[PDB]
C-alpha cells in the first residue's frame, strides 16, 4: 500500500523520499519510489560543493538526471539547499567583500533555479541559518553581508522562479520548548511582515527514540508564524518505532498549512546512521512494522 496515495487521500500533497542517480540504479529503490512515494529530492546533487566547486563553473549531470527521472515518473520535486554553511565550498567561505559575496550568492541562485524553472514544486532556499540559542548562526554570509542575505536569498529566488514554493529550513525544531524553535517564528514572522517571500519552513527531522510525541506541540508552534506551508524533512527515527512515527504523521495531519513529509532515504543501510535503523525498509527492502503503522494510521 502507498503511503503517498495515502496521505493525498487525506489531503495533503505527497509523502516523499531523498534519492540520486546511484540510489535509482541500485538495490530496489526505483520500484519503492515508483509504488510509494509522490515526491523525490536530491540527497546531494543540488548542493552548492556539488553544483558549482568553482566560481560560475556548474556541475548539473547528477541533477538532471534526478529531474528527469522524476518527470519521466510522474514524481513531484523538491530541491536544495541554496544557501548552507555545511555543503558549502572552500572558495565561497574565503570571499571577504560584501558587494562580491551578493554577487556569487545571487548567481549561484539564479543559476540553479532558472535551469529548473517551473519543474521544481518546492526550493530550499536558505538552511541552518540558526544557533542552537536563537542566535543568527555566524556564516560567511552573516559575517560578510550581514542579516540581510536571509532577504536577499529569498527575494532573488522568487524572481528566478515564481512557481517555486521557497523554504527556510533548519534542525532541532522539535520541542516546543526548544528556544530555537520559538526563535525560528519569531524571525520569520517578522520577514514576512517585511515582505520577504518565505512560503515555507521545513523542519529537519531527525528524531531520538520517544521523541515523536513532542512533535505534535512543535509542528503546531512552527505553523503559528503564518507561512503557508510547513513541512517535514530528512524524517528519519532512531529504532523506527511505530509510535514515533506516526505520532510524526498525527502531527503533519493535525496542522492544516503541513503539507507532506519526506523521508532521509528508502533503506535502513543507506542511512546516514544505518546502525540506528531509523528508516523504513529494512536492508532487504521490506517494509518495517513503522511502514505498516502508518498505512494503518491514515486509512483510519
Ligand atoms: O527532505 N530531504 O530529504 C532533503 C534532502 C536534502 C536537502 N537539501 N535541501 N533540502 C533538502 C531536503
Given at each position: 500500500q502507498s503511503i503517498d496515495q495515502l496521505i493525498k487521500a487525506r489531503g495533503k500533497?505527497?509523502?516523499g523520499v531523498a534519492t540520486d542517480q546511484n540510489r535509482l540504479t541500485?538495490?530496489?529503490?526505483?520500484?519503492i519510489i515508483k509504488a510509494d512515494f509522490g515526491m523525490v529530492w536530491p540527497e546531494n546533487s543540488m548542493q552548492w560543493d556539488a553544483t558549482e566547486p568553482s566560481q560560475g563553473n556548474f556541475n548539473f549531470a547528477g541533477a538532471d538526471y534526478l529531474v528527469n527521472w522524476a518527470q519521466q515518473n510522474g514524481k513531484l520535486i523538491g530541491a536544495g539547499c541554496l544557501v548552507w554553511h555545511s555543503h558549502l565550498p572552500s572558495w565561497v567561505s574565503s570571499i571577504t567583500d560584501k558587494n562580491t559575496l551578493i554577487n556569487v550568492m545571487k548567481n549561484h541562485?539564479?543559476?540553479?533555479?532558472?535551469?529548473?524553472?517551473?519543474?521544481?514544486?518546492?526550493?530550499?532556499?536558505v538552511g541552518e541559518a540558526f544557533?542552537?540559542?536563537?542566535?543568527?548562526?555566524q556564516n560567511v554570509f552573516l559575517n560578510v553581508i550581514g542579516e540581510d542575505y536571509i532577504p536577499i536569498a529569498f527575494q532573488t529566488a522568487r524572481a528566478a522562479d515564481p512557481n517555486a514554493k521557497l523554504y527556510i529550513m533548519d534542525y532541532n525544531l522539535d520541542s516546543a520548548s526548544y528556544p530555537?524553535?520559538?526563535?525560528?517564528?519569531?524571525?520569520?514572522?517578522?520577514?514576512?511582515?517585511?515582505?520577504?517571500?518565505?512560503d515555507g519552513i521545513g523542519s529537519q527531522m531527525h528524531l531520538s527514540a520517544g521523541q515523536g510525541a513532542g512533535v505534535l506541540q512543535a509542528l503546531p508552534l512552527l505553523a503559528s508564524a503564518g507561512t503557508p506551508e510547513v513541512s517535514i524533512l530528512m524524517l528519519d527515527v532512531a529504532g523506527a518505532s511505530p509510535t514515533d512515527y506516526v505520532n510524526v504523521?498525527?502531527?503533519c495531519l493535525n496542522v492544516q498549512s503541513c503539507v507532506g513529509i519526506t523521508v532521509?532515504?528508502?533503506?535502513?543501510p543507506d542511512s546516514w546512521r544505518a546502525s540506528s535503523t531509523p528508516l523504513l525498509?529494512?536492508?532487504?527492502?521490506?517494509?518495517k512494522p513503522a511502514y505498516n503503522a502508518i498505512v494503518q494510521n491514515l486509512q483510519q
Open positions: 500533497v505527497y509523502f541500485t538495490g530496489k529503490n526505483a520500484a541562485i539564479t543559476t540553479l533555479m532558472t535551469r529548473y524553472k517551473g519543474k521544481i514544486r518546492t526550493w530550499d532556499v544557533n542552537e540559542d536563537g542566535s543568527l548562526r530555537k524553535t520559538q526563535a525560528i517564528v519569531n524571525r520569520v514572522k517578522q520577514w514576512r511582515a517585511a515582505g520577504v517571500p518565505i504523521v498525527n502531527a532521509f532515504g528508502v533503506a535502513d525498509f529494512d536492508g532487504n527492502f521490506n517494509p
